Design a protein around this nucleic acid. Structure first.
Ligand SMILES: [Cl-]
Ligand SMILES: [Cl-]
Ligand SMILES: [Cl-]
Ligand SMILES: [Cl-]
Ligand SMILES: [Mg+2]
Ligand code: NA
Ligand code: NA
Length: 325
DNA sequence: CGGCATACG
DNA sequence: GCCG
């Protein structure tokens, strides 16, 4: 089992779901306390289990697996023995965990804001609604739309949004293309949001594109909220006899950078962190969603595909469905 | 022990 | 919290 998640296939569904979900609770809790190091280890340990070819049934099967030390091993041991881990259950029950989760789930609210509100004694969404003067416009939107945004987005919803985005993109810039990215591209059947990557086959034609797109969507009455290369929107999605709010991200990249942007927006988040870490630490190359830089030669690697990028990094190719770290 | 991904709004 |  290799040490980096980008070195191993990680399918969407796997054989250790319970164990990984427990470790990811501890990861999430670590994040709420600002311990990014511990969050990463628990995330990585969870991801290792997702990559295994069968269920862990005994503690000895953890021997030699990367990112499993005393703490993660004890978590698994307790789950194997008793079906629950006391530490995990304690986190789940805690007012701190439950409230930070509730607050950080709000669009416009991060760990730092949530934590300050927690310390001020706030606990519920209605606590936040009672004092709207203390909210940003983004947070006000996140709070107004919070119920709909908590409802899973379905693959049928995605098909409908894509058609709508293509229509606006087509008027904004003929020949421009729309690619579904993020979790739905990795094969998820549901999600919390929808991600699209927009480009044009003629380098440079994509400049100034996103404002034109946003203006056209807004004129069609489809935009409930928006704030450039990236747009974080709330869309009005038609429903039977009504509609619901859905988070949609739109991203534009020049076609020269498209493979990097595609790779970068297809995720998973942990996969991208691990891939960038691998690139820099193992290969001495600097990766981001725009390119891959060799800081010795001071040159950028030209990629024509994601396949190119994996090859340049000396990694076997992983399709999106195997990037579910 | 240092490091932990890397951007944009 | 774990790895190198
Ligand atoms: Cl608590
Ligand atoms: Cl409507
Ligand atoms: Cl170059
Ligand atoms: Cl980036
Ligand atoms: Mg997404
Ligand atoms: Na948030
Ligand atoms: Na998104």
């Amino acid at each position: 089992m290799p040490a980096y998640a980008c070195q191993r296939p990680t399918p969407l569904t796997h054989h250790n779901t319970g164990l990984s979900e427990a470790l990811e609770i501890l990861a999430e809790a670590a994040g709420f306390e600002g311990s990014e190091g511990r969050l990463l280890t628990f995330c990585r340990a969870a991801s290792v289990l997702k990559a295994l070819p069968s269920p862990v049934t005994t503690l000895s099967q953890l021997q030699g697996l990367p990112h499993f030390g005393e703490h993660s091993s004890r978590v698994v041991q307790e789950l194997l023995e008793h079906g629950v881990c006391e530490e995990v259950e304690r986190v789940r029950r805690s007012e701190r965990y439950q409230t930070m989760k509730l607050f950080t789930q709000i669009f416009g609210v991060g760990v730092k804001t949530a934590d300050r509100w927690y310390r001020e004694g706030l606990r519920t969404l209605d606590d936040l609604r009672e004092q709207p003067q203390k909210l940003t416009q983004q947070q006000k939107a996140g709070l107004q739309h919070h119920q709909d945004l908590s409802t899973p987005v379905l693959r049928s919803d995605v098909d409908a949004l894509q058609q709508v985005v293509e229509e606006a993109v087509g008027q904004a810039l003929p020949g421009a293309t729309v690619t579904l990215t993020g979790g739905f591209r990795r094969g998820k059947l549901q999600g919390a949001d929808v991600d699209f990557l927009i480009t044009h086959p003629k380098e440079g034609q994509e400049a100034g594109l996103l404002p034109r797109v946003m203006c056209r969507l807004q004129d069609q009455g489809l935009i409930l909220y928006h704030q450039f290369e990236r747009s974080f929107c709330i869309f009005r999605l038609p429903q039977p006899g009504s509609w619901k709010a859905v988070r949609v991200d739109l991203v534009v990249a020049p076609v020269s950078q498209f493979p990097f942007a595609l790779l970068g927006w297809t995720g998973s988040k942990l996969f991208q962190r691990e891939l960038r870490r691998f690139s820099r630490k193992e290969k001495g190359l600097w990766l981001n969603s725009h390119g891959l830089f060799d800081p010795e030669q001071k040159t950028f690697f030209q990629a024509a595909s994601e396949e190119d990028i994996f090859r340049h990094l000396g990694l076997e190719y992983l399709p999106p469905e195997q990037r579910n770290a």
